[PDB]
Symmetry: C6
């Protein structure tokens, strides 16, 4: 499953990611964890729990390895 490999990779490598939300608002930071419904992001020291239903797009700084 592409979604979970992608999120695990950005997590295990501490890649910076911009997370665009459905409404265009944006967050940047690193992925600390995720489950079926949410992604736990950290931006400059602070946790943000984001619902996946509210996410449009993860644009990572560096590109991920996946199959």
């Amino acid at each position: 499953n592409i979604q979970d490999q992608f999120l695990n990779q950005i997590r295990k490598e501490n890649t910076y990611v911009t997370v665009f939300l459905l409404n265009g608002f944006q967050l940047r930071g690193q992925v600390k964890g995720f489950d079926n419904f949410t992604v736990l992001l950290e931006s400059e020291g602070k946790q943000q729990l984001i619902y996946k239903h509210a996410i449009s797009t993860f644009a990572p700084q560096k590109n991920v390895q996946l199959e």
Copy 2:
């Protein structure tokens, strides 16, 4: 389940949390309770029942410790 540990934590510690909503609005308060579809928040003494579908982000006042 990170979601429920998070919410159950900020509920147990009475942490303050900014709820950001998809409609652009952001709300600060304390979590009184939640189920699978909704979060009960209190913002200055007033209840608000908020649908999870309408929420984008929670930003706690102080980071929550979780098992991941």
Copy 3:
């Protein structure tokens, strides 16, 4: 279930509630009934059937006691 308690209490007590919609429009009235997907609100005697998917928040006039 928190949602069902809340809605049934504001229904039983005829509590006025503000409903904030996903589009930021704001409705005010009293809940006359609900099922899994919808809420029946009366505003100045006029019925509205609202899909819960279009609601963001209910803010009661007085706080509900919940178990």
Copy 4:
């Protein structure tokens, strides 16, 4: 079930209804049919298949008697 009861009443009574969509757009007409995902609205004799996921609110001209 409030939803079915409401939609079946306004259908069989031919009640004029404003349908407000998620974006605030308002369509006015009579419901001629519905199923699990859609509602068939007739406006000035034009058929519109509307997805329930796009609907916010039905506001009938006259109140609908329900159980």
Copy 5:
């Protein structure tokens, strides 16, 4: 059987011109060439578009349709 399927199959069969309005109020016109549970394959001047049903608000035909109700 269900109203959505008859409606989409009818306009597809007749190559009816249709406005599709999307959740954000954008509108496309075209003919339906097919659909499945999740998507509608519209053609607006020769040009294929795969539209998710979740992004669609309303199908409005210019020309009224036959439905078993």
Copy 6:
């Protein structure tokens, strides 16, 4: 299943498929992967994981056999 046939032909013929999001924002690229919930688009060498629930429309460059 039209969806899966389409995403696949734009993916194998590495088509410039443009992607309109619910908020109207648009991105061009080629599809490298998809699952039930998500699309992996490369745009300008950069990877982007897009949730399907956020996508409005894929508009290809050349049309697809289905």
